[PDB]
């Protein structure tokens, strides 16, 4: 009566660009770029496949089955499995604020450089403006012009005086006050994904044809643009030069497990609330076979489409693109990217378009980023939830918007930086480690081949059953271990973070995932009679 | 104008340590960076390495890691490097030279040391 | 890394006659080569930089021509007092690398 079943999606097509939509973002486009030329070049192509077949397919078809399948939130499934693992439904919800703290104040700089964008000359051109310094030196200028190492460049000026505007915070220690020109930018955002989100699947798969589709035709354009542009054979030779003696440091592969880890990016929810609202009949091995493959293609030509610009960079300066690709962060997009497209014609054209790109690059992965917790959420306290969707999906935008208080204030890359590396990163790699156990130690895999079996009418083969067993548990071990080991010393704009940053990245770190083993406890104390008998009525599913 | 003046020149025995200075005058300090080439007898130039005067940011060759080390000092605009387990090969002429950050060029260089490694 | 080979360890040259040394890099330049002028006794100086531009305190007499691996640096007239040795240095990729050393005798 009333709710009984839920609804299902309106076509095929919009779920498979939904998934495909979500998994493509900004890393996607820079990140794999940079990490695949900084770590044995074109050899990079090898161990990054290696780490896909064997770690990121089987838990992106094992997410998107188990969420195809069962039908339930990141919460309410736990209480059909495992129990005493429902803690992991709320982690993740945690998790995700942490996400989308920083996640759209990024798109925000974008939208405010893209609000930028309608001059005829473009603001990061010249020198002559409110927030450049004297040290700010630009090009159509006298040439034999030499850097010094207090000189500046006009867009490295406006990206740090003007929209970011880091100079007038000391680190993490001063960053106050908030910008209020990226408050309302991140408003914006969270007003175009309000409108995406809250109407449930309809909109966000009605909008995703839309955010999907445009980054493809935008790098497209910056493609052939960027491969027109002479001495663009430099940045392609620096892209795919074989360096294989990198493949022998035991670094490169950690990189790439990480790299193609968050980019699939299972374990999240997102999957599972996206495979929720299907046909039960419809395949599952098909759908994430193509999307996940399309998602490394696109990475793999949008490394063309940054290194021809860059190849170009590196001809009007002086060549070793590693040198004028030596930062790997936002200022490769907002600086440097932007300071060559500046000096091409109709710069203004394929600059709105960049920043469109960013932008629509971003706002899939948020609409699934809120989606999956969302659907927990309403999943987990039904009829006291979905009263009304707007409701708390408002709620959530809203929490967001102060949430990421933090992140517009002027030293907010900072924080951004903090969140980004410190913080999500090993949590997110815990509670995947902690769900593929789950789901392949608990549940049982034969079970789970069972499950397949009745859905798609097939067992899956022996190749995916080895995997989940064995293969996808020491892949999440494998980099929580490496990363444990040795954490990264954060720098960015020539500042070095605090020795106790990571006492800080550790403490949100660790407020993500207190659900977990204190609803362990949790359940393990309120459930009466001795601990075999309440593990055992803790692990095995409800039988009706 | 542009001054460079180094040390002089230096007898060492074998296995101990040496170092370098380089006083800086007649430009603005914190706007170049320092850097450090080797000249062998009879052999060709052979950079080390730099440093950013303004903290100190040293950047080595990979045949060189380990091999020197390169400081610097604001408050009398000097840099210094030194050199440690010294063999017959290090008896050679080091300069310091002042170089921006682009075009990467040697503009000014230091008179010379000549470092003689031997017992 | 990068070998700039100087085929040329020595050549011989008479006062006013055009002499030019050349340059071999590994890989693709552009235009980031620097000559350096170094006389017996004293210490190396800049002379070009970026292939054919000079430096300030520089004689007309010294000019620089190349673009990609090959590189050339020419004197036109030459005098008694330009006796040194000449080293090129690729400017581009880290490390920076420098050439043989190319001698120029003078011929009489």
């Known amino acids: 009566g009333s709710q009984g079943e839920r609804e299902t999606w309106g076509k095929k097509v919009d779920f498979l660009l939904s998934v495909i939509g979500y998994a493509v973002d900004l890393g996607n486009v820079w990140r794999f770029p940079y990490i695949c030329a900084q770590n044995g070049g074109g050899a990079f192509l090898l161990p990054y496949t290696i780490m896909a077949i064997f770690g990121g397919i089987p838990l992106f078809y094992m997410e998107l089955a188990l969420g195809q399948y069962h039908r339930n939130g990141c919460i309410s499934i736990w209480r059909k499995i495992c129990p005493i693992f429902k803690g992991i439904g709320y982690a993740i919800c945690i998790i995700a604020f942490y996400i989308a703290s920083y996640y759209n104040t990024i798109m925000a700089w974008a939208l405010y450089y893209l609000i930028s964008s309608f001059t005829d000359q473009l603001p990061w051109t010249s020198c002559k403006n409110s927030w450049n310094t004297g040290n700010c030196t630009n090009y159509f200028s006298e040439d034999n012009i030499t850097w010094t190492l207090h000189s500046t460049s006009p867009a490295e000026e406006f990206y740090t005086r003007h929209v970011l505007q880091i100079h007038r915070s000391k680190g993490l220690q001063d960053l106050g006050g908030i910008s209020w020109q990226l408050a309302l930018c991140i408003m914006l955002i969270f007003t175009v994904i309000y409108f995406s989100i809250w109407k449930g699947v309809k909109t966000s798969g009605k909008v995703v044809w839309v955010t999907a589709t445009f980054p493809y035709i935008a790098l497209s354009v910056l493609l052939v643009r960027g491969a027109t542009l002479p001495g663009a054979w430099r940045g392609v030779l620096f892209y795919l030069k074989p360096n294989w003696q990198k493949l022998l440091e035991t670094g490169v592969w950690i990189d790439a497990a990480a790299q193609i880890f968050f980019s699939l990016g299972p374990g999240f929810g997102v999957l599972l609330a996206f495979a929720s609202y299907n046909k039960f009949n419809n395949n599952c091995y098909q759908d994430a076979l193509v999307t996940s493959v399309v998602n490394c293609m696109t990475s793999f030509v949008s490394g063309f489409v940054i290194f021809t610009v860059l190849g170009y960079m590196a001809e009007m300066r002086n060549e070793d693109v590693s040198e004028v690709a030596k930062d790997a962060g936002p200022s490769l997009l907002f600086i440097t990217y932007a300071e060559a497209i500046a000096n091409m014609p109709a710069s203004t054209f394929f600059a709105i378009i960049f920043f469109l790109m960013l932008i629509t690059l971003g706002l899939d992965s948020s609409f699934a980023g809120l989606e999956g917790v969302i659907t927990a959420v309403l999943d987990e306290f039904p009829h006291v939830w979905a009263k009304r969707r707007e409701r708390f999906v408002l709620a959530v935008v809203i929490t967001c918007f102060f949430g990421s208080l933090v992140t517009l204030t002027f030293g907010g890359a900072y924080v951004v930086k903090l969140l980004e590396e410190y913080a999500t990163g090993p949590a997110v790699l815990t509670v995947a480690l902690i769900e593929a156990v789950a789901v392949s130690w608990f549940y049982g895999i034969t079970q789970f081949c069972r499950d397949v079996k009745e859905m798609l009418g097939f067992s899956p083969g022996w190749f995916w059953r080895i995997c989940w067993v064995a293969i996808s548990p020491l892949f999440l071990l494998f980099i929580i271990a490496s990363f444990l080991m040795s954490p990264p010393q954060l720098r960015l704009f020539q500042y070095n973070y605090p020795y106790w940053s990571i006492i800080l990245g550790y403490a949100i770190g660790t407020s993500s995932f207190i659900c977990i083993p204190t609803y362990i406890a949790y359940r393990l104390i309120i459930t009466p009679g001795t601990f075999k008998e309440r593990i055992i009525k803790s692990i095995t599913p409800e039988t009706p | 104008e542009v001054q460079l003046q180094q040390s002089g020149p230096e007898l060492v025995k074998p296995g101990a340590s040496v170092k370098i200075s380089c006083k800086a005058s007649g430009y603005t300090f914190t706007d170049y960076y320092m850097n450090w080439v080797k000249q062998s007898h009879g052999k060709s130039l052979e950079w080390i390495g730099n440093?950013?005067?303004?903290?100190?940011?040293?950047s080595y060759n990979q045949k060189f890691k380990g091999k020197a080390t390169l400081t610097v000092d604001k408050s009398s605009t000097t840099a210094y490097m030194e050199l440690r387990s010294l063999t017959s090969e290090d008896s050679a002429v080091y300069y310091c030279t002042r170089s921006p950050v682009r075009p990467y060029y040697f503009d000014y260089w230091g008179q010379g040391t000549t470092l003689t490694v031997s017992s | 890394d990068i070998v700039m080979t100087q085929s040329h360890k020595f050549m011989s040259t008479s006062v006013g006659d055009r002499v030019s040394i050349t340059c071999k890099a590994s890989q693709d330049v552009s235009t980031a080569v620097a000559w350096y002028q170094q006389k017996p006794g004293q210490s190396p100086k800049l002379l070009i930089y970026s292939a054919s531009y000079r430096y300030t305190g520089v004689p007309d007499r010294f000019t620089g021509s190349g673009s990609g691996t090959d590189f050339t640096f020419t004197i036109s007239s030459v005098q008694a007092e330009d006796l040194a040795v000449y080293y090129c240095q690729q400017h581009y990729s880290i490390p920076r690398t420098f050439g043989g050393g190319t001698k120029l005798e003078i011929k009489r």
């Open positions: 440093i950013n005067p303004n903290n100190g940011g040293t």
